[PDB]
Write a protein that binds this DNA or RNA. Structure first.
Ligand SMILES: [Mg+2]
Ligand SMILES: [Mg+2]
Lengths: 37, 71, 171, 175, 136
RNA sequence: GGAUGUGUCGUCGCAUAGACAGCCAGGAGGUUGGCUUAGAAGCAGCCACCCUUCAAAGAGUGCGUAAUAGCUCACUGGUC
RNA sequence: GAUGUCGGCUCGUCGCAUCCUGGGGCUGAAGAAGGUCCCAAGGGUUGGGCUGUUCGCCCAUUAAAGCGGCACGCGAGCUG
């Protein structure tokens, strides 16, 4: 859980799927996890 | 192949930058003896496929091209 | 895009009203769907037809299609999930229809299946979850995989029969 | 390129995809209004070293070369165009894009090709005899080499409107 | 940064860019979309960002310069006179004004160095290219 | 600052001479490019990005071990 | 033609930007011990030495010894 108020691409593996009113991420590497709340 | 280039021109180390300052230069007949020692590894065709392939390693190291095609 | 729906042998589809009831040999399934999205037989096989071609309908199109494609598969082929137990002394038995697992927890874990799903154990390190409804089968085998998820150090716990597990290693 | 109306009040065109225009010589300096989209696709190709005919809605064909353009500051978008009517025999001073050919022998060691003059003003060229570009070879150039105007090969009949000791292309050192 | 010789103090007022072309000196530029006061330190911050990205060479044109002096409140009061000569120098930037322009770098190389420099600026910016030959 | 939220106009391009995505097979040899260094071998940093074989393979993208290997992409073919 | 002012005590209640407990994600997370971020205000949050002290330093403990609002909460309630 690394809450970065700006969820942008880092590598060619990142996936931006819209959920419960937020900008989330479901990347391959476990460290790469980004959320806005 | 670094063994053959360093002993043909007389290079001890090489070159950090092959653009600003240069090292040496080698002839066309000495490219043939590299093609006769390193022959069971290359899948290259005729003489034209070994005279240029060997000459390409000289560019990175710091050894200038001698003769070649045209005129 | 999604359009063809193969309906083999003893199929009894009755897409009448909002109750798109699909009967068959393995058991009689019932599933509700959208009314504004058209569905019936227009040949030998099956097809779901969407009126609007904007955005809201295209999502519901591929949804309704795959859902009856899963209910039809269920009434003839059926469904079976194959789970594998991994780790020292990790073993599963059976107490009636109930799955009795022993997975490194002080008191053994018992799971009772819902009305329509069945548990099976060939070798006691392999669990088979077979049922009629792919959702319910997914939702159940889901709970068994949750009893002990494969840890990121020794892959210990419940995994799918052919599942791949990446490993970290600390020491 | 096809023009349409010509009123003094631009209220009619402003709301639509149209750009105000003007064409002059010394005998006719009429009012104009053409298409934004059509002008752009064409101008992006042509510029000051090219021309196209403008046929106003009434069947009147005239050849004109672009003299100056004025765009919005807050937007990138052009908002007005000044066309200059072509004679046929003798024209004016034209701004020609200076270009580069071949990798320099100065850009190797740690240099870079600095095109000091992006567009060159050239005296007495000839109409429809206007060169669409101005290619300058740079392979001869080392670090500290300045190519002046009176060192550039112009295409037949053309002369130079700028000083011959003025730097147009230079090879620049690192850092 | 600061200016060499001057007057000491100034004022404040705004309206759309007066003297900022599009393609002078460089190939790609960085244009303001909002009015602001560019602090000496924000330019320096942008410069170093670009200079680092374009390691060796030096082809950065900073078309804006901080010339406006701004003042300050010693700590309290108002029961005294006009104040703080030496607070900070500023460049009055209005939308359209080319702040920076780069040369001898690719579209992609420039896209980034400007994307980086943008994050250090107190206003919204736009990256641009050629086709502006107004008066020379 | 961030976002495959939906609505509408536009600007480049690859495309039934069969694309973008999934799927089976392959992915060079010089060469462990040189230099730099305790090593630096496609991947801690400079210069270049030249050559062969060809249906095709960049002295090379992200991960990896201490450098190797490994695991895949850029590029090529088959079925849709 | 008066809105008593620091600190103590007494009595409370509220916010959460959570000190402890509760649930989670990442970890350079083997385990044990942690770091960091997310959700979480239900209850809980010790006794002394020094100073008018708020604070702070110290002793001895602790699951913890949270931060702030309420006229820097509270003198027609007490101290002084
Ligand atoms: Mg007082
Ligand atoms: Mg009172």
């Amino acid at each position: 859980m690394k809450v970065r108020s700006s969820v942008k691409k880092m590598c060619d593996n990142c996936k931006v799927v819209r959920r419960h009113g937020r900008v989330l991420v479901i990347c391959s590497n476990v460290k790469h996890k980004q959320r806005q709340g | 192949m670094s063994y053959l280039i360093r002993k043909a021109a007389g290079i001890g180390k090489g070159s950090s930058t092959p653009n600003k300052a240069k090292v040496g230069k080698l002839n066309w007949d000495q490219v043939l003896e590299i093609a006769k020692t390193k022959m069971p590894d290359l899948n290259a065709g005729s003489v034209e496929a070994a005279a240029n392939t060997v000459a390409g390693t000289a560019r990175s190291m710091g050894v200038t091209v001698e003769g070649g095609p045209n005129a | 895009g999604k359009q063809p729906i193969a309906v083999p042998s003893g199929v009894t589809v009755n897409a009448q009203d909002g109750v798109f009831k699909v009967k068959g040999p393995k058991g009689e399934l019932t599933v509700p769907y959208n009314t504004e999205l058209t569905v019936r037989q227009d040949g030998d096989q099956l097809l779901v037809e969407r009126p609007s071609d904007a955005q809201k309908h295209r999502a519901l199109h591929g949804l309704t299609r795959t859902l009856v494609a899963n209910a039809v598969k269920g009434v003839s082929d059926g469904y079976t999930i194959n789970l594998e137990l991994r780790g020292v002394g990790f073993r599963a038995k059976l107490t009636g229809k109930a799955l009795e697992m022993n997975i490194g927890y002080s008191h053994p874990v018992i799971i009772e299946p819902p009305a329509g799903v069945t548990f099976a154990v060939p070798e006691p390190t392999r669990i088979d979850v077979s049922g009629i409804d792919k959702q319910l089968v997914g939702q159940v085998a889901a709970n068994v995989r949750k009893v002990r998820k494969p840890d990121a150090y020794h892959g210990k716990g419940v995994r799918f029969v052919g599942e791949q597990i990446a490993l970290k290693a600390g020491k | 390129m096809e023009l349409t109306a010509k009123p003094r009040t631009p209220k009619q065109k402003l709301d639509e995809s149209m750009i105000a225009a003007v064409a002059y010589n010394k005998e006719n300096n009429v009012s104009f209004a053409l298409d934004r989209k059509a002008f752009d696709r064409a101008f992006r190709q042509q510029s000051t070293t090219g021309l196209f005919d403008i046929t106003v809605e009434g069947g009147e064909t005239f050849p004109a070369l672009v003299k100056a353009v004025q765009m919005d500051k807050r937007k990138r978008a052009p908002i007005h165009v000044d066309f200059y009517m072509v004679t046929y025999g003798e024209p004016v001073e034209v701004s020609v894009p200076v270009h580069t050919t071949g990798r320099s022998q100065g850009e190797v060691q740690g240099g870079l090709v600095d095109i000091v003059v992006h567009n060159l003003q050239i005296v007495a060229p000839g109409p429809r005899r206007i060169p669409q570009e101005l290619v300058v070879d740079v392979t001869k150039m080392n670090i500290g080499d300045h190519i002046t105007a009176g060192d550039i090969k112009l295409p037949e009949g053309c002369t130079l409107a700028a000083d011959p000791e003025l730097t147009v292309v230079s090879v620049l050192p690192p850092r | 940064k600061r200016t060499k010789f001057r007057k000491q103090f100034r004022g404040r007022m705004t309206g759309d860019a007066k003297g900022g072309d599009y393609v002078a000196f460089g190939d790609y530029g960085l244009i303001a979309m909002e009015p602001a006061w560019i602090k000496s330190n924000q330019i320096e911050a942008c410069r170093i960002v670009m200079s680092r990205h374009f390691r060796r060479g030096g082809k950065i044109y900073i078309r804006i310069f901080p010339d406006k002096p701004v003042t300050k409140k010693p700590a309290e009061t108002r029961m005294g006179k006009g104040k703080g000569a030496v607070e900070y120098w500023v460049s009055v930037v209005k939308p359209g004004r080319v702040m920076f322009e780069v040369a001898g770098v690719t579209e992609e190389q420039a896209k980034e160095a400007f994307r980086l420099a943008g994050h250090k600026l107190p206003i919204q910016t736009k990256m641009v290219k050629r086709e502006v030959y107004d008066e020379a």
